[PDB]
Design a protein around this ligand. Structure first.
Ligand SMILES: *[C@@H]1O[C@H](CO)[C@@H](O)[C@H](O)[C@H]1NC(C)=O
Ligand SMILES: *[C@@H]1O[C@H](CO)[C@@H](O)[C@H](O)[C@H]1NC(C)=O
Ligand SMILES: *[C@@H]1O[C@H](CO)[C@@H](O)[C@H](O)[C@H]1NC(C)=O
Ligand SMILES: *[C@@H]1O[C@H](CO)[C@@H](O)[C@H](O)[C@H]1NC(C)=O
Ligand SMILES: *[C@@H]1O[C@H](CO)[C@@H](O)[C@H](O)[C@H]1NC(C)=O
Lengths: 326, 326, 326, 326, 326
């Protein structure tokens, strides 16, 4: 055939380690354009982001060079990567033990050595999450690419000439805002410098799950605690009501802890509000016990009325402070 | 022997990278028919679907050709895939890090190059699930196959001529309705175009587990809350009963949060009903507190009777709104 | 040496793809008998069965043939499978992504071509569980083996001449009853026919863990629920005691749903009894509420006495209905 | 160099399948001594033991034979296992799907063919646990090694001549008692026999975690239940206190069931004590209900005093029955 | 080209097993410098530490040598590890089944044989954690490297000449203090001796999650317990309040046990304080029961006043003893 002849005549002595350059001092302008097609998940327990995407490689090759006119056209040939040279561009903060690939076993070539190896992969990266806004958070994550082994003296990791990648991959759990990728000059040491590509993915949470699971039960428990001071001390249910709120707040705290991650910086607003209704319960149990001991003149009516007013105004201001996020 | 000499004569210089076509401009008509023999699971926590099945490959081969009359019949020979050409048809939204195979190490051949590579695999795909009807939902799943590396200019990914695949794989947990596969012409970019095969599996949930675990306790707590307004204010148990319902609703909310997935769009109907009975408990506890403070003329009888009637009508209408699904 | 000489002389041109037969129309009589030496687990959550065992392969080989008389005896030679032909017999409903092996890297040979390859493996299969009797169930499991690629026209998958495998692998968690293997002729399509070997493992549950965790607390909660009607209505404890039973039943339902699997058909007996004690606490709370509102002539004594009699007889008859299983 | 000359001159025709013996009837005396350097864990949920260690191989080799006198000394050469013959000695109850290795890629050799391959591995084995004494248990586990493929007619799996391996690997979670390895002749069938090596590791639980998490709360709730009969029937708190104990024992039962394994033989002592205190709560709630029923002559004082005495003596005798273990 | 001919001329007969030394008695001075760039996690459940980093390997190579002057410069060439010699330096207490690598498939070489292999890896090691100060702890962990197969007679595992690695890679969950690495001479046996490089990472916990989820609810439950002696015995709520505290403490214990690791030595301070609050509730319920029995002259007022004083001083002193950690 003809493709077999081309493979025989252009993979004669092509070692998979030799740098595909003519002049040793010259480098190869390896391009890159990473695209995320679907974000899988963002687990804050281990600060892992799992996003499905494809990485667009493109580099010139001095050794791969053939003319189509004598070889009957055939301007598109597909070569597996195991037989041609390959850049070592990998994601720096990969979560997986090994950097895995999907259909990264075949790369197209052109007559002017213009390979377009495009692996697809489930990138598992690390990003910092600011849970101060949690769950109404906008934790932007970063995907980073580059070569750990060789540096700018070997390859010039550059961005694609056409960077029309202003896409919005809207999902059912997150809304994704793509950020135009940039190039930064990494410095392994003082003498030598490396190259790197940064891309940004801004995640805005649009799922109702966390609101329904935390905000509604917590605010409604705060609602019952707001009505705590009304029960008369002699009813023998005031302290029982308070301890019931203790149990309910403890259950909500256990659930939130089961959900909210261990590796945390500042406390989330929902966790703070749950803690704050918990101390609400503590303080108004203090006042209920004081009132019942004093009952056995009865001026406790003014006391718990002003107490109710103070808790109304302070709880509503903390609630609006929390709501200002959304 | 005969098979050994046939292998020697037909694998002389068959590289595993060369496209098996005579004319370079011509393509190879690769067929496909995916069949699901047993669905394993559908985990909505990560929107993953695990289904066991086999995928049927069929393509003509120009190079592999022999006459059986001189070679003593032998119309069926079994060749491992590592020695012959192979299409890169893969599932687009694979959940696994790598696209794994089961007994995809041997493919049959015919004298007119008519290979029948039939891998078996545990396909792990992604689905979009409308949790509104959950658990009485019909979350359809799609399995999509195609070639990421090479495109229509290389292969024509086409459906089987005989598509009698109207089967129903009825399981003990899901009712599976097969959908006749379709072919869609994927467009990687404006200049180049690709091919793809999409199949559908409609999943009907027939498991008693979910409604037993959620609907029964939730409607039961709704029943108990419905009876709350009879408890006299002076009995010192109405508030205790209400806080007991608070604790029960909190426990049901914890179970729902543990089971119902985080990656959620609209709220499920069972979650809505649970939140609705939870705010029910809030409101009728408010009325109980107002009644007990007003007790210490006693018109609360008419008040809680009309209250009970209003909650009868609204609880029955929300319950029948839920039941309209089933 | 002599073993190296034999290997050089009898593995001259032995490709690992050629069918080891003299006449092409003739097939090779591959024997098989799977033996389970220790069952690991049976997880009903994903219908997975993990059993450790060994699979006995035995097939004649036309090509491998030498006389020991001129080769100084030596009737026992060990060959790794990577260099000899191997049947593709695999388990049809494997749960693992790939069909893995243990010490399946060496197979013995005889002078009259009687290879006795015996892999050991952790078989991970699928079972259908009739959990109506759960936990006092007898969920039988089936292990099925055969060749997906090649069929009866290639190999005759048969049982061993002697099938004395009537063993009982009694464990500390399961009673294992082996079933003699059977051969069934699988039909991939109308024109072609395949072969398969099925074996059965009857699993009796002898563990006390599930009993102690579910039946004892459930029946004792039902016991307390039975005593609820004796509490006088005016004691302000009947409603509190009833809601305490409601919370206890809710917690027990949480733990049961945590343990009992999602992929379910008919409801298990313990789950039915738990739902039934939920109904119990609901109904007797209804009657207690009616009694307390009616208290404010007091004929409720006859009412709750006949109520206790009716509920005692129905609870004991349902309890003996459950006990009839064990 | 010189080591390259050794490698060229001793790996001339070294096949990795030939048995390293001169006379075919003779066997090779393969020695072994497994050593555990750090036990990772013992999970009773799946009866798995994860222990880090190294396994010591030692066998004579006929083909490796060279004298240092003409070869400039060099008594120490390191050979990777891929080019040298190795025995198939593998753990008989391996828990992993495949038998994994750590730095089992290089083995030393001597001039008198005395290969000393010493792999390191995380052995994941199966052992039987007597949960009766749990947590104050001494569940000894066994590691068993041998050759599944070939038998005593091929290798004589023997123990090290110097077996001074009476070490104590004391950890922060388990007390490890080493047991001298023994050799047994495994019988695959009646005609042929195999070989095997047993080592024993006795695990004494010295952790305080299980005591603090189960014994303390269970005995403490038992302490509260012991004081239940003092509460007067008319105080309207005896029944509420009893149901609070019901909820407490239910919570401890849930957490214990979450921790205690499913694959269980006889009931653990802590589980038995928890069941005992739970039926304690049932019985004394029965007596409280009867006392309040007769409350509405009051001879109940003698009744609950003698009840307190009898249940105190039986509580303390069961407690000392538990304490006899520790 | 030039790199291709250099590779042909310098990988003529370079086996990947021969020690790269001229004199057999001489050793090769393999250097090492480990760097941790980002700690992932420290899971005390299995005493595992996951830290992302890179390992700096550097060794002389006698065979690998060229003169750049006649080879047109080219002072740095990139070579994959599969074709050159490699040290077997690995982490001694690796948690993973196999020692995995990231981009450890390419190593640079210099003209004076100064290979500078720099693998990157997710080190999963074992370290001892002193849970006494937990969560306000400083549990140091150790990473250790060395050669299990060959010893000092083969390689002199030395530390980097420039050890300016005094970096503080502070994260959002742990404050990381690097410790300058040291060299220790491991002794496999009496006759032979090995080498090893040890480095230390001091991990200070700065996360707010742990104290927020444990100490705050625990200290506030102790606070609520402290108010208990005020409730009058005749109010029929003191026993109910106490049993509510018992249930809350039981829930808190269940949550802590879910979080606190099983592999434990000394009890953590938070767990001890929780045990103290159980003792709190038990003792004050005992006194409450005694007071209510004695109520039916009333000198109990002095009793619970002095009880409050004694328990307040004991709780405040244990609280300040706990706070002395932070
Ligand atoms: C790499 O490309 C950038 C793009 O502007 C250029 O500034 C830089 O000089 C290039 N470096 C090399 C070594 O080619
Ligand atoms: C592929 O097959 C479809 C089936 O009708 C046909 O319409 C299309 O033209 C074919 N394309 C090529 C490139 O053969
Ligand atoms: C396979 O063996 C069975 C055993 O009786 C026999 O009935 C059948 O004819 C055999 N088939 C072939 C193709 O040898
Ligand atoms: C193996 O060694 C044991 C050690 O005493 C010996 O009793 C036995 O006879 C040996 N067997 C063979 C086949 O060498
Ligand atoms: C290894 O290096 C250390 C560094 O001082 C030195 O003390 C020791 O003697 C060396 N050993 C060998 C065998 O070179």
């Amino acid at each position: 055939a003809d493709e077999k002849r081309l493979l025989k005549c252009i993979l004669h002595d092509y070692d998979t380690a030799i740098r595909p350059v003519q002049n040793v001092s010259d480098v190869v302008n390896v391009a890159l354009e990473v695209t995320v097609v679907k974000v899988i998940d963002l687990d804050e327990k281990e600060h892992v982001l799992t996003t499905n995407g494809w990485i667009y490689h493109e580099w010139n090759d001095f050794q791969l060079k053939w003319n189509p006119s004598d070889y009957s056209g055939l301007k598109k040939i597909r070569i597996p990567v195991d037989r041609i040279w390959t850049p070592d561009i990998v994601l720096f903060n990969n979560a997986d033990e090994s950097y895995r690939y999907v259909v990264d076993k075949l790369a197209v070539v052109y007559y002017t050595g213009k390979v377009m190896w495009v692996p697809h992969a489930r990138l598992r990266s690390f990003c910092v999450l600011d849970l101060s806004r949690f769950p109404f958070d906008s934790q932007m994550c970063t995907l980073v690419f580059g070569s750990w082994t060789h540096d700018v003296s070997s390859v010039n990791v550059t961005l694609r000439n056409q960077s029309k990648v202003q896409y919005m991959i809207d999902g059912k759990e997150w809304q994704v805002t793509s950020v135009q990728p940039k190039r930064y000059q990494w410095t392994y040491n003082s003498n030598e410098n490396y190259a790197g590509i940064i891309t940004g993915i801004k995640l805005k949470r649009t799922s109702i799950y966390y609101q329904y699971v935390f905000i509604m039960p917590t605010v409604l428990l705060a609602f019952l605690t707001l009505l705590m001071p009304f029960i008369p001390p002699l009813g023998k249910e005031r302290i029982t009501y308070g301890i019931g709120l203790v149990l309910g707040c403890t259950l909500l705290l256990m659930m939130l802890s089961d959900r909210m991650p261990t590796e945390l910086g500042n406390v989330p607003v929902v966790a703070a509000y749950l803690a704050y209704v918990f101390v609400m319960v503590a303080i108004n149990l203090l006042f209920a016990i004081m009132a019942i001991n004093m009952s056995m003149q009865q001026l406790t009516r003014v006391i718990d009325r002003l107490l109710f007013g103070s808790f109304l105004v302070l709880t509503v201001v903390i609630t609006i402070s929390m709501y200002a996020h959304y």
